[PDB]
Amino acid sequence: VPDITTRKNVGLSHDANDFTLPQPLDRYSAEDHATWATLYQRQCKLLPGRACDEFLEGLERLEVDADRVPDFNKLNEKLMAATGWKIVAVPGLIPDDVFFEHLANRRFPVTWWLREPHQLDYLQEPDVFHDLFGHVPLLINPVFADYLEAYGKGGVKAKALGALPMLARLYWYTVEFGLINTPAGMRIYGAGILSSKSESIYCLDSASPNRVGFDLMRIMNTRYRIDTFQKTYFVIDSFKQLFDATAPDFAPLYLQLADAQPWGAGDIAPDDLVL
Numbered sequence: 546v547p548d549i550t551t552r553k554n555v556g557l558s559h560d561a562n563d564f565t566l567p568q569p570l571d572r573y574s575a576e577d578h579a580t581w582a583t584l585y586q587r588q589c590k591l592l593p594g595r596a597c598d599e600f601l602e603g604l605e606r607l608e609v610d611a612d613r614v615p616d617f618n619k620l621n622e623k624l625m626a627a628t629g630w631k632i633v634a635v636p637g638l639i640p641d642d643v644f645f646e647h648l649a650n651r652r653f654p655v656t657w658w659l660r661e662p663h664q665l666d667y668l669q670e671p672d673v674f675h676d677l678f679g680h681v682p683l684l685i686n687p688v689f690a691d692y693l694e695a696y697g698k699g700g701v702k703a704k705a706l707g708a709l710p711m712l713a714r715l716y717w718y719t720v721e722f723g724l725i726n727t728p729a730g731m732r733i734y735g736a737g738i739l740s741s742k743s744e745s746i747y748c749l750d751s752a753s754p755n756r757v758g759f760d761l762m763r764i765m766n767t768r769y770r771i772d773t774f775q776k777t778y779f780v781i782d783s784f785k786q787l788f789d790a791t792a793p794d795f796a797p798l799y800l801q802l803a804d805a806q807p808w809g810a811g812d813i814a815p816d817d818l819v820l
């Protein structure tokens with residue numbers, strides 16, 4: 546049983562070093578554009594009062610197509626002038642070192658293909674709607690864009706054994722599933738939540754999960770689960786705080802956490818500050 550990444554990339558090559566390729570525009574059907582249109586309108590009706598304001602405005606400022614899979618090159622004209630970043634198409638999942646290298650150079654990899662109609666909510670493997678709709682708009686906030694860039698640079702430098710899981714955890718709990726407390730109430734900045742119907746509602750509506758204040762060392766030592774609703778969400782007060790977190794060189798931090806047993810995705814640590 547071949548995964549969608551394989552079926553979608555048949556007859557398509559990718560750079561051996563950075564896994565990029567020109568966006569294969571001819572490969573989007575009429576149905577894919579309708580699938581995109583459906584995803585897009587469904588999220589936009591859920592996000593008011595949910596997504597943080599920066600996300601909403603980035604969507605507006607970049608003019609992410611509402612009715613068809615965006616043309617990466619066109620979007621880049623705006624994204625580059627506004628933030629200094631560009632998106633590059635990748636075939637699907639790429640190696641971490643290649644991913645860190647892109648972020649370090651203000652390139653955001655985006656899986657080019659779209660989920661098939663039979664699918665629809667945060668399926669196995671991220672796709673263009675998740676990657677583009679969920680990740681790209683926030684780059685409109687210069688501090689969050691600076692955070693991503695610093696995160697990639699730290700990744701390029703990481704050597705210590707155990708560092709990769711720690712950085713995967715940090716990325717997951719901020720970039721993919723992060724929440725942000727605002728004067729108007731708790732909001733969302735995580736891509737894995739913003740491109741998902743179910744997660745968008747759950748992360749702000751459920752009594753079950755823990756909602757914990759951002760804490761760097763705690764996060765890097767916290768497991769996460771892939772196919773279920775998150776059991777813990779980490780909350781930042783501002784993007785600056787997120788950026789400031791990348792200020793220290795992480796080298797000694799990996800060594801400190803290296804032998805620690807990690808927290809379960811559902812645990813509450815002694816030093817947590819919980820909602």
Ligand SMILES: [Fe+3]
Pocket residue numbers: 671675676680721736737
């Ligand atoms: Fe993602």
